[PDB]
Design an enzyme around this catalytic site. Structure first.
Site, PDB file in Angstrom:
ATOM      1  CB  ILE B  52      -0.976  -0.019   1.202  1.00 34.01           C
ATOM      2  CG1 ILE B  52      -2.010  -1.126   0.987  1.00 34.01           C
ATOM      3  CG2 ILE B  52      -1.679   1.321   1.365  1.00 34.01           C
ATOM      4  CD1 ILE B  52      -2.831  -1.447   2.200  1.00 34.01           C
ATOM      5  CE  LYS B  55      -1.218  -1.972  -4.458  1.00 33.97           C
ATOM      6  NZ  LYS B  55      -2.376  -2.763  -3.974  1.00 33.97           N
ATOM      7  CD  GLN B  99      -3.175  -4.293  -0.869  1.00 37.21           C
ATOM      8  OE1 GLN B  99      -3.376  -3.245  -1.493  1.00 37.21           O
ATOM      9  NE2 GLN B  99      -2.249  -5.177  -1.231  1.00 37.21           N
ATOM     10  CG  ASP B 124      -7.081  -3.683  -7.709  1.00 40.62           C
ATOM     11  OD1 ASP B 124      -6.126  -3.095  -8.270  1.00 40.62           O
ATOM     12  OD2 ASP B 124      -6.979  -4.206  -6.575  1.00 40.62           O
ATOM     13  CB  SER B 196      -2.164 -27.282  -8.992  1.00 41.55           C
ATOM     14  OG  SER B 196      -3.540 -27.495  -8.731  1.00 41.55           O
ATOM     15  N   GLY B 265       6.311  -6.356 -10.925  1.00 38.96           N
ATOM     16  CA  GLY B 265       5.795  -5.551  -9.846  1.00 38.96           C
ATOM     17  C   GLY B 265       5.761  -4.046 -10.038  1.00 38.96           C
TER      18      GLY B 265
HETATM   19  N1  NAP Z   1       3.894  -7.988  -9.221  1.00 33.51           N
HETATM   20  C1  NAP Z   1       2.723  -7.800  -8.593  1.00 33.51           C
HETATM   21  O1  NAP Z   1       2.351  -6.685  -8.232  1.00 33.51           O
HETATM   22  C2  NAP Z   1       1.915  -9.044  -8.235  1.00 33.51           C
HETATM   23  C3  NAP Z   1       0.423  -8.968  -8.094  1.00 33.51           C
HETATM   24  C4  NAP Z   1      -0.257 -10.127  -7.795  1.00 33.51           C
HETATM   25  C5  NAP Z   1       0.458 -11.322  -7.631  1.00 33.51           C
HETATM   26  N2  NAP Z   1       1.808 -11.372  -7.756  1.00 33.51           N
HETATM   27  C6  NAP Z   1       2.494 -12.632  -7.529  1.00 33.51           C
HETATM   28  O2  NAP Z   1       1.967 -13.678  -8.336  1.00 33.51           O
HETATM   29  C7  NAP Z   1       2.032 -14.916  -7.631  1.00 33.51           C
HETATM   30  C8  NAP Z   1       0.754 -15.771  -7.834  1.00 33.51           C
HETATM   31  O3  NAP Z   1      -0.451 -15.109  -7.391  1.00 33.51           O
HETATM   32  P1  NAP Z   1      -1.873 -15.832  -7.508  1.00 33.51           P
HETATM   33  O4  NAP Z   1      -2.954 -14.844  -7.286  1.00 33.51           O
HETATM   34  O5  NAP Z   1      -1.995 -16.430  -8.857  1.00 33.51           O
HETATM   35  O6  NAP Z   1      -1.899 -16.968  -6.375  1.00 33.51           O
HETATM   36  P2  NAP Z   1      -2.808 -18.222  -6.015  1.00 33.51           P
HETATM   37  O7  NAP Z   1      -4.161 -17.756  -5.628  1.00 33.51           O
HETATM   38  O8  NAP Z   1      -2.195 -19.034  -4.933  1.00 33.51           O
HETATM   39  O9  NAP Z   1      -2.873 -19.032  -7.381  1.00 33.51           O
HETATM   40  C9  NAP Z   1      -1.853 -19.952  -7.770  1.00 33.51           C
HETATM   41  C10 NAP Z   1      -2.290 -20.654  -9.057  1.00 33.51           C
HETATM   42  O10 NAP Z   1      -1.227 -21.439  -9.573  1.00 33.51           O
HETATM   43  C11 NAP Z   1      -1.602 -22.817  -9.655  1.00 33.51           C
HETATM   44  N3  NAP Z   1      -0.500 -23.657  -9.206  1.00 33.51           N
HETATM   45  C12 NAP Z   1      -0.122 -23.988  -7.831  1.00 33.51           C
HETATM   46  N4  NAP Z   1       1.016 -24.797  -7.927  1.00 33.51           N
HETATM   47  C13 NAP Z   1       1.276 -24.930  -9.250  1.00 33.51           C
HETATM   48  C14 NAP Z   1       2.191 -25.810  -9.806  1.00 33.51           C
HETATM   49  N5  NAP Z   1       3.091 -26.455  -9.052  1.00 33.51           N
HETATM   50  N6  NAP Z   1       2.178 -25.995 -11.249  1.00 33.51           N
HETATM   51  C15 NAP Z   1       1.300 -25.320 -12.022  1.00 33.51           C
HETATM   52  N7  NAP Z   1       0.427 -24.474 -11.438  1.00 33.51           N
HETATM   53  C16 NAP Z   1       0.460 -24.314  -9.999  1.00 33.51           C
HETATM   54  C17 NAP Z   1      -2.877 -22.991  -8.800  1.00 33.51           C
HETATM   55  O11 NAP Z   1      -3.803 -23.923  -9.388  1.00 33.51           O
HETATM   56  P3  NAP Z   1      -5.153 -24.335  -8.663  1.00 33.51           P
HETATM   57  O12 NAP Z   1      -6.201 -23.361  -9.035  1.00 33.51           O
HETATM   58  O13 NAP Z   1      -5.539 -25.686  -9.128  1.00 33.51           O
HETATM   59  O14 NAP Z   1      -4.964 -24.353  -7.193  1.00 33.51           O
HETATM   60  C18 NAP Z   1      -3.471 -21.583  -8.802  1.00 33.51           C
HETATM   61  O15 NAP Z   1      -4.404 -21.453  -9.866  1.00 33.51           O
HETATM   62  C19 NAP Z   1       2.368 -14.609  -6.172  1.00 33.51           C
HETATM   63  O16 NAP Z   1       3.676 -15.086  -5.884  1.00 33.51           O
HETATM   64  C20 NAP Z   1       2.350 -13.084  -6.088  1.00 33.51           C
HETATM   65  O17 NAP Z   1       3.438 -12.611  -5.309  1.00 33.51           O
HETATM   66  C21 NAP Z   1       2.538 -10.270  -8.056  1.00 33.51           C
HETATM   67  N1  L37 Z   2      -3.822 -11.262  -3.571  1.00 32.87           N
HETATM   68  C1  L37 Z   2      -2.634 -10.721  -3.773  1.00 32.87           C
HETATM   69  N2  L37 Z   2      -1.533 -11.558  -3.899  1.00 32.87           N
HETATM   70  C2  L37 Z   2      -0.324 -11.069  -4.197  1.00 32.87           C
HETATM   71  O1  L37 Z   2       0.652 -11.842  -4.325  1.00 32.87           O
HETATM   72  C3  L37 Z   2      -0.127  -9.556  -4.369  1.00 32.87           C
HETATM   73  N3  L37 Z   2       1.105  -9.151  -4.529  1.00 32.87           N
HETATM   74  C4  L37 Z   2      -1.310  -8.679  -4.272  1.00 32.87           C
HETATM   75  N4  L37 Z   2      -1.340  -7.264  -4.336  1.00 32.87           N
HETATM   76  C5  L37 Z   2      -0.258  -6.529  -4.658  1.00 32.87           C
HETATM   77  O2  L37 Z   2      -0.407  -5.326  -4.634  1.00 32.87           O
HETATM   78  N5  L37 Z   2       0.826  -7.096  -5.183  1.00 32.87           N
HETATM   79  C6  L37 Z   2       1.981  -6.353  -5.434  1.00 32.87           C
HETATM   80  C7  L37 Z   2       3.181  -7.051  -5.477  1.00 32.87           C
HETATM   81  C8  L37 Z   2       4.353  -6.428  -5.736  1.00 32.87           C
HETATM   82  C9  L37 Z   2       4.400  -5.071  -5.942  1.00 32.87           C
HETATM   83  C10 L37 Z   2       5.760  -4.491  -6.316  1.00 32.87           C
HETATM   84  O3  L37 Z   2       5.872  -3.297  -6.560  1.00 32.87           O
HETATM   85  N6  L37 Z   2       6.763  -5.345  -6.553  1.00 32.87           N
HETATM   86  C11 L37 Z   2       8.024  -4.922  -7.191  1.00 32.87           C
HETATM   87  C12 L37 Z   2       9.189  -4.885  -6.219  1.00 32.87           C
HETATM   88  C13 L37 Z   2       8.895  -4.742  -4.775  1.00 32.87           C
HETATM   89  C14 L37 Z   2      10.111  -5.130  -3.975  1.00 32.87           C
HETATM   90  O4  L37 Z   2      11.078  -4.339  -3.938  1.00 32.87           O
HETATM   91  O5  L37 Z   2      10.124  -6.251  -3.428  1.00 32.87           O
HETATM   92  C15 L37 Z   2       8.481  -5.843  -8.306  1.00 32.87           C
HETATM   93  O6  L37 Z   2       9.479  -5.495  -8.969  1.00 32.87           O
HETATM   94  O7  L37 Z   2       7.914  -6.941  -8.438  1.00 32.87           O
HETATM   95  C16 L37 Z   2       3.204  -4.310  -5.897  1.00 32.87           C
HETATM   96  C17 L37 Z   2       1.988  -4.970  -5.630  1.00 32.87           C
HETATM   97  N7  L37 Z   2      -2.539  -9.307  -4.098  1.00 32.87           N
END
Ligand code: NAP
Ligand code: L37
Ligand code: NAP
EC number: 1.5.1.5
Lengths: 295, 285
Positions: B52, B55, B99, B124, B196, B265
């Site tokens: 947050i 953001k 959030q 969002d 999965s 991110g």
């Molecule tokens: N950069 C950003 O701002 C940002 C924003 C959001 C998320 N993220 C990152 O994205 C990642 C994932 O988020 P999410 O919302 O998708 O999480 P999630 O709700 O836990 O979903 C994970 C998905 O991946 C599948 N999966 C689990 N293990 C797997 C495997 N071994 N092989 C193939 N597929 C697998 C699951 O399938 P099932 O449906 O069958 O369980 C599920 O659909 C997190 O690490 C988060 O940090 C980053």
């Molecule tokens: N439900 C849910 N699951 C998640 O995994 C996330 N991350 C989420 N909401 C969220 O806002 N995610 C998110 C994650 C990463 C950043 C971000 O800016 N990441 C940067 C680096 C941050 C750092 O220095 O670690 C990046 O480069 O990925 C912003 C929002 N919402």
């Protein structure tokens, strides 16, 4: 070892029979309860009348009270909207649909009309809210469009588990292709969606253990493309002149049946596969809405 | 020898600069008008607090007025619904978000809370209305989730046209995977979605000209599986911080790759800011 044929006429007959029994039992368990469906029509199209009368007939046989509201060609958008709001508000109506396309002399925004339908009553499952729930996995209570709903039922009729299998969907329309992808994904198949911009479609199709085609391109998917032992679901309904048929025309699908039936383990014929399943699916979606309201 | 690095930190910096200038011009057209974004939080998670803050920091720098509402862990679904209704009705708030994940001691149906948000302020893009429009190809009328948006933007930075490519999305969540599939499909790629329950995940990933991974499993996608010359998008944030893709190996096979951190991110926050400035502009229009 030719493909086993998935008789949609027989399977749908069974489904409708069971829904009748279910409806009879609901009424006896809760005296006074009346599962009710409503169909809103604008204009007087010949094809719509035929389709509507068929839905109403299937409804009355299952014991579902079906109401048909037919508005004139002179109807305006605000009037249609008024009726939708009233149908949404009528607690005696469990599910309803707007028969498309609308037949009016005035310009009516179809998308706005459809999206005015309360999600909990959208039996055709075409509202954005409903498409959104289905696309994100809320299969437990959302509605599913009749065609793709029928396709999943046919796939399940084979007895082969969907989870872990690679399903290929050729087509991505709102009516079939898109919600079809959603059903396959949430039933745990690994899904690949193809369309008019897909390169080497033959190679893509050949990877599908489960293949659902809905393109409207008569017999484009050749038997050579089919993966050996695949389940082939063909939604195509394409007309071709044939003086050797009782009415001078034959119906062919989007798959080249004759050569595909030799490769697949299960296949839906055309006509007689997915087509006969659609009205039963709408009836099933109507009973679902009725049971959810009842709870 | 290795893949070109998709610098999300530099790319997001350029977007934010563009957005700041747009906001400045908007204020010059209508002095006194201020785009406003609100972030509703339930609980007090350490990770959510940092997210947050990022953001809020990007907003302030762009000229957007950002409000943070933090509710206690004792909060009920009924109470969250009250604030959401207030934010929907607050004419000064152009776009708000809840959030995730909600940190409460009581059960709160997340879909119901999220679906209470007015679609016009759903920056969002998590409402079923917005998800349904995207899922069916109606891109004129909706807000797309910030992560998928950021990924699509990163894919375009390669200059390689998406149409006709075979894309593979590993993951199917409402936040990343599901909407990511939609963005690629409607950008004319042939898309395969894995999860999965996918068998032979390595053979599936190998088919991807474009690969987006959002599983939350540390470096599970091996570089061996990557198709030579593929564009690899890694959404993973796993604890050192690592992505869902084994970077060192994957970089030797891919043509373009997103690092972790500094990849997806920063792009996610920039896109959220873009949706916010958009919701303010559609309000003035
Ligand atoms: N950069 C950003 O701002 C940002 C924003 C959001 C998320 N993220 C990152 O994205 C990642 C994932 O988020 P999410 O919302 O998708 O999480 P999630 O709700 O836990 O979903 C994970 C998905 O991946 C599948 N999966 C689990 N293990 C797997 C495997 N071994 N092989 C193939 N597929 C697998 C699951 O399938 P099932 O449906 O069958 O369980 C599920 O659909 C997190 O690490 C988060 O940090 C980053
Ligand atoms: N439900 C849910 N699951 C998640 O995994 C996330 N991350 C989420 N909401 C969220 O806002 N995610 C998110 C994650 C990463 C950043 C971000 O800016 N990441 C940067 C680096 C941050 C750092 O220095 O670690 C990046 O480069 O990925 C912003 C929002 N919402
Ligand atoms: N049982 C029933 O009563 C029932 C109900 C509904 C439909 N159907 C039948 O199902 C068929 C499909 O209808 P629809 O709703 O999906 O309509 P549509 O809008 O015409 O759908 C065509 C889809 O397939 C793609 N496509 C077009 N040509 C293709 C090709 N040559 N190769 C690969 N993909 C192709 C298009 O991609 P783009 O998006 O790029 O255009 C589009 O997504 C029709 O023939 C109809 O008769 C039957």
């Amino acid at each position: 070892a030719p493909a086993e044929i998935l008789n949609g006429k027989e399977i749908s007959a069974q489904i409708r029979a069971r829904l009748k029994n279910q409806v009879t039992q609901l009424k006896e368990q809760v005296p006074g309860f009346t599962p009710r469906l409503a169909i809103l029509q604008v204009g007087n199209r010949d094809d719509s009348n035929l389709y509507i009368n068929v839905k109403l007939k299937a409804a009355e046989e299952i014991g579902i009270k079906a109401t048909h509201i037919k508005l004139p060609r002179t109807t305006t958008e605000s009037e249609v909207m008024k009726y939708i709001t009233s149908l949404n508000e009528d607690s005696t109506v469990h599910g309803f649909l707007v028969q498309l396309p609308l037949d009016s002399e005035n310009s009516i925004n179809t998308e706005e009309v459809i999206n005015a339908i309360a999600p909990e009553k959208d039996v055709d499952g075409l509202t954005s809210i409903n498409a959104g729930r289905l696309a994100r996995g809320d299969l437990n209570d959302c509605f599913i469009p009749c065609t793709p709903k029928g396709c999943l039922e046919l796939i399940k009729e084979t007895g082969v588990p969907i989870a872990g299998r690679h399903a290929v969907v050729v087509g991505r329309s709102k009516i079939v292709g898109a919600p079809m992808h959603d059903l396959l994904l949430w039933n745990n198949a690994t899904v690949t969606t193809c369309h008019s911009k897909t390169a080497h479609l033959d190679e893509e199709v050949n990877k599908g253990d489960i293949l659902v085609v809905a393109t409207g391109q008569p017999e484009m998917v050749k038997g050579e493309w089919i993966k050996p032992g695949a389940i082939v679901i063909d939604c195509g309904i394409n007309y071709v002149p044939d003086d050797k048929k009782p009415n001078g025309r034959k119906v062919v699908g989007d798959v080249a049946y004759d050569e595909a039936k030799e490769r697949a383990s299960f296949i839906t014929p055309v006509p007689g596969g997915v087509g006969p399943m659609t009205v039963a699916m709408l009836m099933q979606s109507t009973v679902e809405s009725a049971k959810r309201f009842l709870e």
